[PDB]
Amino acid sequence: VYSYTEKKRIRKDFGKRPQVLDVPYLLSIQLDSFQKFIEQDPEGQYGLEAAFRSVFPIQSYSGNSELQYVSYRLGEPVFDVQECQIRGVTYSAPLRVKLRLVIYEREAPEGTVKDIKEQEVYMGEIPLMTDNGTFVINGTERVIVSQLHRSPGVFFDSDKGKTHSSGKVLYNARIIPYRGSWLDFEFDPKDNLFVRIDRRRKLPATIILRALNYTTEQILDLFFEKVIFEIRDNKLQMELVPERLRGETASFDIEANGKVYVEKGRRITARHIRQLEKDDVKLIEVPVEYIAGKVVAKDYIDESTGELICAANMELSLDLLAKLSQSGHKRIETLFTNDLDHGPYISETLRVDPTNDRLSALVEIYRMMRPGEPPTREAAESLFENLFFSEDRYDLSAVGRMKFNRSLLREEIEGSGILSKDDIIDVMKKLIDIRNGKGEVDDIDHLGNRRIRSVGEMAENQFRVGLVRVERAVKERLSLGDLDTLMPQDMINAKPISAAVKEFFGSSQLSQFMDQNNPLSEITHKRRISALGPGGLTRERAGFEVRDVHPTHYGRVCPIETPEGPNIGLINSLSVYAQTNEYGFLETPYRKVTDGVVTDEIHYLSAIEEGNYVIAQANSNLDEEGHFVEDLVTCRSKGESSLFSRDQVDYMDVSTQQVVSVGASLIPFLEHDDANRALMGANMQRQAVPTLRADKPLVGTGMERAVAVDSGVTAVAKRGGVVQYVDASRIVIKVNEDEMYPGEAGIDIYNLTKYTRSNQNTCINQMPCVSLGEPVERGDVLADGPSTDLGELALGQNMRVAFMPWNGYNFEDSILVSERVVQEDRFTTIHIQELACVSRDTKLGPEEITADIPNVGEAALSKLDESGIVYIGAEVTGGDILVGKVTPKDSSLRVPNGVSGTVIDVQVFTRDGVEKDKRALEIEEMQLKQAKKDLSEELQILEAGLFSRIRAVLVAGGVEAEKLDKLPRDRWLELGLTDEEKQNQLEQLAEQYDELKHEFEKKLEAKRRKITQGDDLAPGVLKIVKVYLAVKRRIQPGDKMAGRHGNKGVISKINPIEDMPYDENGTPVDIVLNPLGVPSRMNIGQILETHLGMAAKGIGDKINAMLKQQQEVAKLREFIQRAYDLGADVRQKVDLSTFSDEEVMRLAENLRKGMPIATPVFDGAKEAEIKELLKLGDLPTSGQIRLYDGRTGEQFERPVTVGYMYMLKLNHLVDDKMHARSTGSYSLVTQQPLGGKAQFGGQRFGEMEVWALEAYGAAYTLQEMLTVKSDDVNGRTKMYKNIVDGNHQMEPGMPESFNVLLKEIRSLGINIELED
Amino acid sequence: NKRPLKSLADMIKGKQGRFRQNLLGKRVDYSGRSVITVGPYLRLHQCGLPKKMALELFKPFIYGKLELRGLATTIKAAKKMVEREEAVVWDILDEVIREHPVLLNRAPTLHRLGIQAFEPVLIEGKAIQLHPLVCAAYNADFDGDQMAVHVPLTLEAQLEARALMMSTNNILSPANGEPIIVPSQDVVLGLYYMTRDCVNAKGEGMVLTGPKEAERLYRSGLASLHARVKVRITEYEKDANGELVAKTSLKDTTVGRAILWMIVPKGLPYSIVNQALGKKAISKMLNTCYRILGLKPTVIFADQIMYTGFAYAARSGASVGIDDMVIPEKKHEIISEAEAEVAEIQEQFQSGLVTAGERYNKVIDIWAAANDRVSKAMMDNLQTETVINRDGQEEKQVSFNSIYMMADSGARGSAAQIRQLAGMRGLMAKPDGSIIETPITANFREGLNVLQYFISTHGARKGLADTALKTANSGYLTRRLVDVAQDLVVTEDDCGTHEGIMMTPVIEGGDVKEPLRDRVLGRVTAEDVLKPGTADILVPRNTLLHEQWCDLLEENSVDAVKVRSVVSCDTDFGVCAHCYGRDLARGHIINKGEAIGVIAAQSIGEPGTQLTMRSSIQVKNKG
RNA sequence: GCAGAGGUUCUAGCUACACCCUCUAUAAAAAACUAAGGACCACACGA
DNA sequence: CTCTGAATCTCTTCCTCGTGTGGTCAGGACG
DNA sequence: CGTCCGAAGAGATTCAGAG
Ligand SMILES: [Mg+2]
Fold first, then answer.
1. A637 lies in the same domain as A665
2. Is B198 flagged in the annotation as binding?
3. What is the spatial distance between Cα A380 and Cα A357, in angstroms, rounded to a whole number?
4. CA pair distance A1088, B445, nearest whole angstrom
5. Is residue A904 located within the same domain as residue A843?
6. What distance in Å separates the CA atoms of residue B39 and residue B42, rounded to the nearest whole number?
7. Which residues are recorded with the post-translational modification N6-acetyllysine (chain A)?
């Protein structure tokens, strides 16, 4: 079965591998994340709830006052998305929050409250995301990109190599929290374990143990293994265990139980260990010289006086041995030191550490944290407990605790957010073990250590910041507050929380201005995964490691779609099938592999557990039983590609498109072109400008439909049915009876967005894709949005391309374009400009907007209306006047020079209080008329639908066809119908219609007030006039045109069609590319794409030939079936007999322009399949044909390659780039060019160009262009007067920038002057 | 915004400080930018330029001419006339662009030739047209590359731009004497296709009166472009004291090589156009033309050779296709042998005969051997497989395949860049640089496995990040090099210093990396060189070593030549001309004054972007 | 045409980069005409 | 016991130009 | 109506080993 719109033009899909999992909703990463944030979560986890619950204690200091959160509910947005975008206001929901204030009696903490005050308070103003997963901040559609940052937890880095400049590897452990203070435990080059908290001065890390209420004895009991020594008559008989002898040297002669085991100079072999274990030796005599090298563990005092004979952790000498022997210390505890692995590291720190008590440790920590002031014991204790033992000032998220327990190999998954003594000692023990050799350091770039912070998590963090900021003020106010003297609304204000949220959403390191020029651009910018951002590595601070792709990126982050330049690999996109785990990690679908069967069950796997199993390659053949036909299959066990037997395999890739993202998946033959060319092609697809009439690509991937549907550019059908009425501005869908709810179903109305200004000044145009009466199913495409054709993403426009040099006009990378392309408007793109005029307050009276402008001609004022605003639809040109504004004593807005076009609409916003001019009244009246017309249209349409609902029910059980036509349709409650459930349904519809009639005038009045009320504007402005200019930029020499395979070039010449190379058929090639760019830049995919497009157009031409002549539908059906079969078995498998025999004609007419072919990313068309496809048509199997010269007329030898490759048109048009300037306004430093942009500017003759002129014998052109052309005011004036005089003579003078430098150096206090 | 606020020292230091932002290099007026266009019809002394850009840049000149001719009484009326773009304004504009050079300027001006002068040719459009030859000098693409145009104002500025900065005056790069305007990518391919031969081509065998008859036969279509035919040529040589003598002979050649003969100037011999004429051959041709004919004949010859190369590359139709890249028939058996060998090595490791390290080394070695074998098989299939007759039984010739012609000619491509298309792509390394044990066996003509493409994108991301870091490192190095320099200019003409450095061809254990001919060329000796005959003044003490002297040195078999080094110069606050040597951009001694510190710094720093980041003694030959 | 004012237009026009005429304390026979301001930080993208 | 060399700590950049956007001391009421 | 609140190297700075 196929969808009806798919029946219109069904895409020939290659790919032998059968798909098991349908492509997920590409915008899930944003929509699902925000649905988690704004949702009311009863569990109070993950949402505005956790944020309120985490910060709602409100405990007064000795005031018995408490305020608690009870519930909240986001209000309905004041303005709809379209209304907020046109007004410039944010799309936000008022945050109705219900709060309960309770006051307890004094000195009665356990007593009940004396009064309860519950009320709903408006705090904050939280913006919402549209159905397309994008915010609207200030009239701009702004999207928040998900941030990939190092997850909270513990990571044992190395910093191997450069440190200490001796090859000695250091080891450090960072306790990175979600919010709080970092805690790094580093090693001194002399193997001393230091602590570095918040990257402050290095400190002996043993001080933190003392700060955690631990003495030396406890520290050595935790971090070292006690060895018991017994004083005996036989020279202090020593107790040794078998395990401690492994890896030891010949310390002495081991003789126990009157038997010798190991002699002098004999290594302790495992055989010796086994035989002494069989003998079970426990006590071994040791020479007194050996104990000198041991270190005491615990303190010892004599039993007579109790004085300190020997403290803990110092070397033992002969005098110490004599003192402990004479005292009578029978039991002696010593540390087990093994320089091989179990080396001493805490002991060295304790030698370095001069602190012996917890108070001294706290004092030193305070000194190293807050120096310059005398610390206090209470102050130090408070600082430490607020720094590590306090939830408010320090917290690890559930992901942080999970990572902590993963790295520490703990058992529990969850735990307290704050740390503890056990956590610190466990981290130190693991760091010590890493130093010893057991265990391995972790990789920061691993996706198991870098989670993804979505928009919901960022918004929750900013909300928590706002809540704590207002909590500080509430606590401060409540200290002196009085009970029962105020409403629970004065202490909390929406101002700071709203300011924080608005600042985050509008101006942030991550609040990216959405590049809304392509559906692919929107779909890949909302899925963008940036490492940069708040709480993230910066570009300069980012290492080479982070930029560079990790083996664990497979299936999680696309390794092909990254922005080249300053941030390469830092803003990498997310692969098509990857989804974010509930802890922020990146999962990946993976088919479970059973005993030998590749089972269809899809198990999402994170990066940490991917290594544990072995992953099979997607390009592994199966025998339809899940059995690899392939006894050894290539696999990815631990990030290493290696052949594995079938029985070894534990998991398989979900499909062949897993690794690539949506931006890189749409490139056909991605398996052929080079990775750099693939990267550039994926990047350039995001910046193609929509053509006027977008058309499907002849060769594609099959994800274009998925990208177009998933993105919000098109108008998908939420409910199926039939198209009752279709219009270029609206589409009405009559929902089917089996797809509509019993109540309030009616029919669906879709208001397609007409020509609207976009973020990159392009047209967001939606054209209907259906006619009247066309059946439509659920989730179907109805309107072809920008760069969309028949529900398929149509970025550019495919055309004939011949690969051959042509007189140098395609010299190295330039593109040659025929006159035929320009003639048929293939690349004419509508650009909507936003020329906004503002009337601010001015001294000595304000400025008017009337048409009275002095020192101007009547011709310029002819376009403007009587009130000084350009007539809608007027075709203005460069330098023309749009709206007449004169300042009090000629500041009217004018079209910028060069740009032209016709005004599409002029919207005016006027603040309340100032009377609106004639044009504003006319526009407001037309807006009211349009709103009333739309409301009446929906009134009549929904009334017709509801009557059809009623009439259909009234065909049985009291049917009166004649009686219905008699009485007017307004009243039907008097009709006689059986007292059954049908009568109840009619009564329900009648009551609903009555309530709707009551609400109709209310909402109409609300709309009238919305269009009447003065729109909020910036302070000190009268009214703002926005004029939208539609520029139709045709293709021109210099316009940057680029295909999908990384081949980019500027159009050199628009060559007349008569000069184009034509084949024997006479059809001239539309574009003549350069073959020389194929071998070096290995974009060989474009050659495969060219051949497949040639085959597709051959099929289309055969269909056209058998369609232009009146042929039987049987011939069309058999040819279409032959085309869709195409030899080698494919997943497509479309049968033409199941069609209705008249939609076959529609299909053939839709394939007249070319056969649509889908080439999946990594299992697309092979060379044999393409050759067979060429053989299907009249075209040769070689793919290249003889072409005759356009001018000479004789065929080119060595027949050239032609085909219809899908090449885009990037938005880097030459029209934008022209920046010529002679003289203009100057800067502060008096550098004349004034930072060239829209502002009329000269290009920075930078330091490199100055060096270049210095290398030449240039001292006059350089001098003129560094002095008289740039900043010398007298010099500039004299040069201008001289050139207009005709004498090109330079009056040198001196650059004013040097005078500025002299003044700045003098202002420092350094006299710098010149000698005369 | 919680950011450090700029102080009185933050605006005197750093990139954004007053020095490097407003004094060292400052924005200028009379400047415009646009994307660039090829426009092969131009000559390198001129460039295309849009009408709007010429109107805006030359506004003061247009105002002055309007005032002089009385079209507008006042600047104000003339400015209104320029806004109206009245037809009279365009005619005035054509007068101020007759001989007014403009300085084409690409943004990353790495070396001296980054900015060059051009006579603007008014074109309708909005894209600057840059001559194809100077694109290599500019390192400029046609992929959205934009370059600024600056208008010299004063007579001194325009005059020195014409005399020095013109592309006609910049033929040899300052880094080395080799030409910089050499046919680079497409014209070289056209010449290479032109100068070849089929062993059996249409119109092969008949004798031709001259190049005119060769053109007549080719254009009429009755003789193939490259067919081995004897032609009669009037080869001109200047073996006399500047006089050109004529030598007429029947040199066996092809039609295509005879076509180029009318392009080359008189002085050049025919032995330079009788080869396949790749990139290196054309570079040597242009260098010989510059060293023999001079500058103007070299410019005219370069323009004509560009024209013919483009025209006959268009006529060639040197396309690219799937059948143009051939898979070796032995590639499958080489892959099978490599798989068998790695299986044997793994089996040996499993038993324990070979541990991990030696197993890894063995696998890497055998995979490299298989890669070399498949590369050789690919080259044999790509240059030897071609079978074509000679009106007889059987013969084998050098291939005319599209990719082989586009790679062997040096037009664009290399050995690895052609291996990655038909042969095994090779062992591809991980981010850390350690080689993946199992290579990317599949090539680009065939598909790539998902893991194979993952390793490929590992390498590609490594290369892209390396380039991104390396361009910044090279820019910093260029800045340091320029600034340790820029006080060193040629202040004197000679110092009479006998000191110097003994120039000797460099040997690093292998063959001669650089012969003494190309190492001492253009430098003035310090003491008289002598041949095996003692007390022989083969070259006097203070004579510049031009091409003739170096050629004489090779045939006299000199070993070490003491030469005057700039280090040994005793001149204060500069160096003398003799101690420096040839300008490396003009065929004469360095001019007294020219700044050579900045030239040297730019020459050193320009290839920084092209750099990278990471027994027994046996006699070789008889002697 | 260098310090000011007036003139036929259109409040005001004396070279202000700036457009016509008069003279040194007085205002009109006269058509082409008029305006002299403007930073930093972040994001994305191109080479 | 006073310097020696050596580890430690602190400074100083770390390309070069474009083109679109958006955010920015924020005195505030009283004589 | 105005006015007063990572990384990479160099060099300075401790800092230390050995007679
Ligand atoms: Mg380029």
1. no
2. no
3. 13
4. 9
5. yes
6. 6
7. 997, 1175
Is A1199:B317 a contact under the CB 8 Å cutoff? yes
Cα B550 to Cα B547: distance, rounded to the nearest angstrom: 5
**Which residues span the domain enclosing A537?**
25-151+444-574
Residue A217 shares a structural domain with residue A250:
no
Q: Using the mean position of ligand 1's atoms as its centre, give its distance from the Cα of residue A137 in Å.
A: 37
- Using the CA of B73, give the nucleotide whose C1' is nearest: C19
Of the three residues A574, A604, A638, the one that is the final residue of a domain is A574
Q: How far is the CA of B391 from the C1' of C38 (A)?
A: 81
Coil, helix or strand for A206?
helix
Which residue from A1199, A1099, A1194 is spatially nearest to A1154, judged by alpha carbons? Answer: A1099
Calpha distance A1125→A1122 (Å, rounded): 5
Of B31, B445, B456, the CB nearest to A1221: B31
Is strand C in 7 Å reach of the CB of B27? no
Q: What's phi and psi for A690, nearest 5 deg?
A: -65, 135
Query: Has B145 been labeled as part of a binding site?
Result: yes
CA of residue B101 to C1' of nucleotide D19, angstroms: 27
Look at residues A1282, A1285, A1280, A1281 and name the one whose alpha carbon lies nearest to residue B68: A1285
The residue type found at B158 is Q
- The residue in chain B having the minimum alpha-carbon distance to the alpha carbon of residue A1038 is B127
Nearest CA in chain A to B401: A1198
Backbone angle region of A1106, left / alpha / beta, with phi > 0 → left and psi within -120 to 50 → alpha: alpha
H or E stretch at B527: none
Q: Is B579 annotated as a binding residue?
A: yes
Residue at which a domain ends, from A1217, A1241, A1257: A1217
Q: Which residues pair with A1081 in a beta bridge?
A: none
Between CA A548 and C1' E12 the distance (Å) reads: 37
Neighbours of A329 (CB within 10 A): 18
CA angle B24/B27/B33 to nearest 5° reads 130
- Whether residue A1057 sits in one domain with residue A1206: yes
User: To 10 degrees, the CA torsion angle through B531, B535, B540, B544?
Assistant: 30
Breaks (C-N over 2.5 A) in chain B follow: 614
- Closest-CA distance of chain B to residue A439, Å: 21
Contact A982, A951 (CB under 8 A): no
Chain A hits for B67, Cβ within 8 Å: 1284, 1286
Ranges assigned E (strand) in A954-1097: 1021-1033, 1040-1042, 1048-1055, 1062-1063, 1071-1073
User: Which domain CATH number covers A632?
Assistant: 2.30.150.10
Q: Ligand 1 centre from B147 Cα, in Å?
A: 11
CA distance A465 to chain B (A): 16
Both structure tokens of B402? 């599209």
Q: How far apart are CA A1275 and CA B154, in angstroms?
A: 12
- Burial, A1154: exposed, middle or buried (Cβ in 10 Å; 0-12, 13-18, 19+)? buried
∠A962-A963-A967 over CA atoms, to 5°? Answer: 125
> Is B569 annotated to bind ligand?
yes
Q: Encoding tokens for residue B306?
A: 């560009």
Distance E15 C1' – A426 CA (angstroms) = 35
Q: Does residue A812 contact residue B184 with C-beta atoms inside 8 Å? A: yes
- Residue A151 is given by DSSP the state P
Q: How many domains does chain A contain in total?
A: 9
SS3 of residue A763 by DSSP: strand
User: Gap positions in chain A, given as the residue before each gap (C–N > 2.5 A)?
Assistant: 889
Same domain flag for A85 and A117: yes
Query: Number of helices (H) and strands (E), helices first, in chain A?
Result: 35, 57
- CA A831, distance to chain mean position in Å, is 26
Q: Which residue is nearest to nucleotide C12 (CA to C1')?
A: A889
Give resolution, Å, one decimal: 3.4
Contact A1184/B at CB under 8 A: yes
With an 8 Å Cβ cutoff, are B444 and A672 in contact? yes
